[PDB]
Design a protein around this ligand. Structure first.
Ligand SMILES: [Mg+2]
Ligand SMILES: [Mg+2]
Lengths: 402, 402
């Protein structure tokens, strides 16, 4: 019988964000520099305002930065993970959650997860910042456990059900993504309800253009980042039907479950409606699943962690729905490669012009794998835990201690 | 025509919480000292764990502390408000939300509100911590506007629809509250699902005892603080029916909309089911309202603010439902006194043994009104803004600047 150490210390650092270096990248996908496609007139709930139409950074999509949580066992072995929360995430970990973590067995992952959820229920809002922090802790625990046992997380979960993960790429250049070997390209919408028919025409034209350049079998999708309403989304979906748009994603703010139900009903035959990257907690996904949307897309570092993701996958599978996580690099890879209902995954372009395979969480993760020819072979994930190390060369800040 | 100044500065401070003096009280109702009824074996989602059964403080219900937001106009006049968020709340205000606040007209309240909601949608979780912060800013803006104009908020909203507010008291001594003139007493449950039939018998006996001591017309209610499940809540409701329990409150975690719908359908004839203090954003309340519960109880400082509260009131009124806010002191009084569908209000006992009328937000609010024989006449509220001043004697901390 293998002997397991207890958890000795949990620490939290951050990089980027409003109190550090802007454009740090890492865990915060949107903490980028200038001239980045991810900040290029992307439609949002705020783009209706002239001062916040051109840049999401201008309204503060980058204020949080990256949260880093590292758990150390009594035998000095460490595990860690990253997410979006930054300094505030550090407060929550160092001043609150540490009490449920330290002293526990490295295998007490689900127990710590339940305690974190129960203890923060009064201020977590079931998603966002607080849940992102909880997720980071959950992931750091799985990493530590795997590194202690000496097994990749995907094997602890029950093994891979496919020999490689195939990816679609999210970014402004589906055509370049096809050349790279991805199976599809998801583009962000640039116009919203306030732009009316002109907005619909322009984004639909963008899709038509890529369909011409990419051929019929390369998938094309639209990401709407909570920026629309039911009528606008319905018009855009129908305007893109002639081009076989595979799915239209996150058209509405997360609380609008009733709206999603209606939008799905209004969708063109065969076109899928998806959402979920901003939802958190298993119960929220139960409600989301019942709206009838086709694919739920939780972010492993935002939905509650791997522990929660695995439950969401089961929920989707029980209904014949698919689960395709939002980015998340290795934190998603080790999980989805074991899900029969996750036939493909997402690679969210961090490359400013979507022309190169810059790592998903560059540069906070050392030896972070990237898709090669649009795929990641399971052997690439054959490393303890989530298989990566923390890049301490980055300027990690420790705002709190205990 | 009255001339209005622009907003010049917004600042945030905090007292109590994990990074300050424990038990500071103020905005955080649960940041109390020892031997307080509010921490005496109260049933919670965590009380199933032996180490967290006796005290909520033990799992961290008091880590946030009080957030204080003060907005200063170009003419040097100021407005402020308090809520539960502490240090992290200050980060959000000083490092993100300030951009939408400063430079605006003191009358641009709804505009700033929409911008705060839209800009934080990606990390707010539609409730909890981030929403508490947004709420505090919203209230500070209303306070400032009312003080600049020279009118009480209740008059800006369209005046009182009742000459006085009648209160029920929340605490361990309904019998004493009756002596104080209250119209009813709401008691917290001490046992949960894991305690089974014994737990139900005990809390039911507690109600039975107070019924005998308070008479038939004095209302009695149970607060369950998200600690139960449908079956347990149903058993307790029926076990308390013989004593004419007026309502059973927040039996389930906030995301369990479907559970609330079933519970309301299972409730004894005439007994009401309520919830809402932990919900945030108007859209969440739309979903909550559709479950059919009788009363929605948002906390003005947590639901999104007064701007949101007024919308929730209309939503409930359109359906014939009631809106009875959670505590909130003056932030509720000025709003509810104008709502036809808020026939009574809540006074959450801050007195350790519920023997005195210690102010709702003691001691952060100078000259804070309290019910006089269970009531607060509109004349008490006839002061600019929310009619109170900040207690600068408290050890306010300014963790961030901009
Ligand atoms: Mg997306
Ligand atoms: Mg309550």
């Amino acid at each position: 019988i293998m002997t397991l150490p207890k958890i000795k210390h949990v620490r939290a650092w951050f990089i980027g964000g409003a109190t550090a270096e802007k454009g740090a990248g890492g865990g915060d996908y949107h903490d980028q520099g200038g001239n980045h496609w991810i900040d290029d007139h992307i439609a949002t709930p705020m783009s209706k305002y002239r001062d916040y139409e051109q840049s999401r950074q201008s309204f503060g999509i980058n204020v949080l930065g990256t949260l880093i949580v590292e758990v150390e066992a009594e035998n000095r072995q460490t595990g860690f993970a990253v997410s979006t929360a930054g300094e505030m995430g550090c407060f929550i970990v160092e001043k609150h959650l540490n009490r449920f973590i330290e002293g526990k067995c490295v295998s007490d992952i689900k127990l710590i997860h339940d305690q974190m959820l129960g203890a923060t229920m009064y201020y977590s809002g079931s998603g966002g910042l607080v849940m992102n922090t909880i997720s980071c802790v959950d992931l750091a625990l799985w990493d530590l456990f795997g590194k202690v046992v000496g097994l990749p997380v995907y094997k602890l979960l029950g093994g891979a059900v496919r020999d490689e993960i195939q990816f679609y790429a999210t970014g402004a250049r589906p055509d370049l993504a096809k050349e790279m070997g991805f199976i599809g390209g998801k583009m962000p919408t640039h116009w919203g309800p306030h732009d009316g028919d002109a907005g619909i025409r322009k984004d639909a034209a963008m899709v038509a253009d890529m369909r011409e350049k990419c051929g019929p079998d390369f998938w094309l999708m639209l990401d709407c980042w909570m920026s629309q309403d039911v009528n606008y989304a319905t018009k855009l979906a129908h305007a893109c039907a002639p081009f076989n748009l595979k799915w239209i994603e996150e058209c509405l703010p997360p609380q609008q479950y009733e709206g999603y139900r209606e939008l799905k009903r209004n969708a063109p035959a065969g076109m899928m409606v998806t959402s979920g990257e901003h939802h958190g907690t298993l119960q929220s996904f139960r409600t989301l699943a019942e709206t009838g949307i086709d694919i739920m897309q939780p972010d492993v570092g935002w939905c509650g962690g791997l522990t929660t993701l695995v439950e969401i996958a089961a929920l989707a599978k029980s209904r014949g729905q698919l689960v395709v996580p939002h980015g998340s690099s290795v934190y998603s890879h080790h999980a989805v490669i074991t899900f029969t209902n996750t036939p493909f995954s997402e690679f969210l372009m961090t490359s400013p012009d979507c022309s190169t395979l810059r790592p998903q969480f560059d540069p906070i993760l050392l030896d972070e794998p990237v898709p090669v020819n649009g795929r990641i072979h399971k052997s690439v994930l054959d490393k303890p835990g989530f298989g990566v190390e923390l890049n301490r060369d980055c300027h990690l800040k420790r705002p709190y201690s205990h």
